[PDB]
């Protein structure tokens, strides 16, 4: 599908950026989307919790990944923790995509299932920052689906509050920067000298 953008840009420059070819391309976009809608209704796209459960019995490697807790008998730095999560998350995308399942078309197109976000639902979360950026030295050992604990709950609440404070502050001071640059860099003009 990414090859489509290369096709359109090979059409504009072929006909010399004419005003007529812009209208025709504007017509193609409308017709392509309308016929796309009919496929969704007839075929249907669903998300079901039973889809994950059914896959567990057939594929043994998936069962171990679902119930995975960080071993606590070995010393691990904060660099090794990130290595484990990336190692496990990478293997998840290989098994799901290669084999048939409900979510096969959700991953191959890569539109709706972000690689990092989807890992938190299945695999463990890891570590979270605090109000002052310092890393909290209490990594979460349980995935979202498997459940949470009270000590882990407090760490999660810190992350949510930081989003509200940052979002509110950025809204108050958002257009301050764009006003300064826009006022100055406006008087430029193009001449046609060779």
């Amino acid at each position: 599908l990414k090859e489509y953008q290369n096709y359109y840009t090979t059409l504009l420059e072929h006909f010399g950026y004419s005003n007529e070819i812009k209208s025709i391309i504007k017509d193609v976009i409308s017709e392509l989307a309308i016929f796309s809608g009919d496929i969704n209704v007839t075929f249907g796209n669903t998300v079901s919790i039973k889809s994950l459960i059914d896959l567990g019995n057939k594929v043994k490697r998936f069962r171990e990944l679902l119930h995975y807790r960080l071993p606590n008998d070995e010393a691990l730095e904060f660099n090794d923790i990130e290595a484990i999560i990336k190692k496990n998350l990478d293997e998840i995308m290989k098994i799901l995509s290669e084999t048939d399942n409900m979510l096969r078309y959700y991953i191959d197109s890569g539109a709706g299932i972000n690689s990092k976000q989807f890992g938190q639902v299945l695999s463990l979360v890891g570590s979270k920052p605090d109000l002052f950026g310092k890393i909290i030295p209490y990594p979460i050992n349980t995935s979202f689906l498997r459940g949470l604990d009270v000590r882990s709950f407090y760490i999660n609440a810190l992350g949510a509050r930081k989003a509200l404070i940052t979002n509110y502050q950025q809204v108050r001071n958002s257009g301050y920067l764009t006003r300064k640059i826009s006022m100055l860099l406006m008087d430029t003009k193009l001449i046609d000298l060779d």
Binding site: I25, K26, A33, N45
Partner: protein
């Protein structure tokens, strides 16, 4: 071709016909005739018969004394220091009355009085001017020497500083803007200086201290006007000059619409029946064969509840007109390219209770918004000649990316439409 700012002279545009001499703005339970809120000069508040332009300005006469120009005061305070303690009178006295000279601590020239400061201004400058640190300021004052001392202080109309004489049972209440307090102080002071008629050597301690105090209030007037009307964000400079409110406008919500070209939208019945209000009356008047007064009351009844006679005239308007009715749609705030577009109208919703604007899904990504419940602003465009200049902002012209020259990625398949094609294409 090029705007330029420079100083002005008060004595050239002075008008003798209108001037203000009164202390109490209120007399006989009404606004006075020669006060600050006078109706003879500045006009009337809620009366349109007077037809007095805002540019009308008033004058206050000060004579024969002179004052330092308030605009130039901050410059002079930097050219030489200690101006606050050089135009003030602090004469001491012994028991009998003989003056005691305590000038040992003070400088050679201090506490001389304003009326003597003006006479010997040329000689006083040379003593305390630094030629290696304030070279620019020194040359500026030499060029503009006539406007150092002013004679008359202007005052603008009350249309910008309103005041109400609303009455109540507990007693009459008067409310005004803060600037009026200082304007009523300078008039009172000057009125209390010219009482002397017979030729008499006025005592210095009775007249000189008042002149210095008056200049203090004159300086604060310039600070107040520039710190409350122009400098602030809510001031007139950044609210009514570079931005403005505007008529012929509406606000609405977003609701997805399918099965139509990419530049066709459908507006609710109510908003389109009032934005294009004036053109509707013109169409009704000719067909129905009635004058404008009779047609107006017909349009009033056709907007309270949904009907059919008005709708038939509505549909024909968007079909026969040149170019089709169009409007500019933007989003608060605009920070991204294409946040404001130039769309077209192609459908009118039959329902009366519907109050949502129906747009396509592809065009949504351009605004970088979503259906969370944001409110847009709609501004129609009328002039035919003006339309051709705005056509460059249409979504057709944004199809090519200005950044690189390739096909723009924003006006492409996004969200579920990407998934739908992949199922069929593979």
């Amino acid at each position: 071709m090029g705007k330029k700012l420079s100083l002005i002279d008060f004595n050239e545009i002075y008008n003798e016909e209108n001037l203000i001499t009164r202390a109490n703005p209120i007399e006989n339970h009404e606004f006075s005739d020669d006060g600050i809120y006078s109706e003879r000069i500045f006009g009337s508040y809620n009366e349109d018969d007077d037809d007095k332009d805002i540019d009308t300005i008033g004058w206050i006469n000060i004579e024969p004394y002179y004052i330092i120009n308030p605009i130039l005061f901050t410059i002079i305070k930097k050219c030489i220091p200690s101006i606050n303690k050089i135009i003030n009178y602090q004469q001491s006295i012994d028991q009998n009355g003989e003056n005691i000279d305590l000038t040992e601590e003070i400088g050679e020239d201090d506490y001389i009085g304003l009326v003597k400061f003006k006479d010997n201004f040329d000689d006083l400058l040379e003593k305390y001017t630094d030629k290696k640190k304030y070279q620019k300021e020194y040359d500026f004052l030499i060029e503009n020497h006539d406007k150092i001392f002013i004679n008359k202080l202007p005052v603008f109309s009350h249309k910008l500083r309103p005041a109400t004489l609303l009455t109540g049972s507990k007693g009459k209440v008067l409310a005004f803007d803060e600037i009026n307090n200082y304007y009523n102080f300078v008039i009172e002071y000057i009125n209390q200086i010219n009482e002397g008629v017979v030729s008499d050597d006025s005592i210095d301690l009775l007249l000189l201290p008042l002149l210095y105090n008056m200049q203090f209030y004159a300086n604060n007037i310039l600070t107040r006007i520039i710190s409350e009307y122009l400098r602030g964000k809510k001031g007139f400079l950044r609210k009514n000059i570079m931005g403005s409110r505007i008529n012929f406008s509406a606000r609405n919500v977003i609701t997805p619409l399918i099965g139509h070209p990419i530049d066709e939208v459908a507006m609710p019945y109510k908003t389109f029946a009032e934005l294009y209000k004036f053109q509707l009356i013109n169409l009704i008047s000719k067909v129905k064969g009635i004058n404008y007064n009779e047609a107006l009351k017909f349009w009033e009844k056709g907007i309270l509840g949904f009907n059919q006679e008005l709708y038939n005239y509505m549909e024909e308007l968007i079909t026969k007109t040149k170019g089709g009715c169009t409007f500019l749609l933007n989003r608060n705030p605009t920070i991204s390219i294409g946040s404001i577009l130039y769309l077209k109208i192609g459908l009118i919703k039959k329902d009366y209770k519907d109050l949502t604007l129906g747009i396509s899904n592809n065009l949504l990504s351009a605004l970088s918004g979503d259906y969370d419940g944001d409110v847009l602003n709609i501004i129609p465009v009328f002039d035919n000649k003006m339309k051709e200049h705005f056509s460059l902002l249409s979504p057709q012209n944004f199809l090519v990316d200005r950044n690189n020259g390739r096909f723009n990625g924003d006006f492409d398949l996004q969200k579920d439409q990407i998934l739908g094609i992949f199922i069929l294409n593979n």
